[PDB]
Amino acid sequence: MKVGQDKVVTIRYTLQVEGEVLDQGELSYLHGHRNLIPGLEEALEGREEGEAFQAHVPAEKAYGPHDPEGVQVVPLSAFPEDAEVVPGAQFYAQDMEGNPMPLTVVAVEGEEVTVDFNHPLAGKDLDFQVEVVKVREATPEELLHGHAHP
């Protein structure tokens, strides 16, 4: 059976970004319901059960481009005093209205900290090695929920 709309597909995968492995594992998903990033589902569309392949997914079809407006300067005094504020450090944050805005520290210059509110994979292309383990039809309940059962 081929991967297509409304099929429940099991894959094994490895994810690399710029030659470094970030994740690997096995999962099942209902295809065609935005359950995985769009470029990965595009790469899976039409594959036969058993097929192994490579997929280079551009940033636009993964976590999106890097928005320059996500890079902002905040005061050092805003950070918790017991924290290490150094390049690469990640922190949970919110705006004044309580909207989540997690950040990564880019640089510290005196009492000014440059941070980045973009997702860490924004602007990055993703490289996948994938094996299609199994393809089957969805149950009516899976179709109703739009997700493969756990």
Binding site: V73, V74, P80, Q94, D95
Partner: peptide
């Protein structure tokens, strides 16, 4: 944000 980040973010 343009000029407002320095006043408008709480960090936890």
């Amino acid at each position: 944000f343009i000029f407002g980040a320095r006043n408008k973010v709480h960090i936890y």
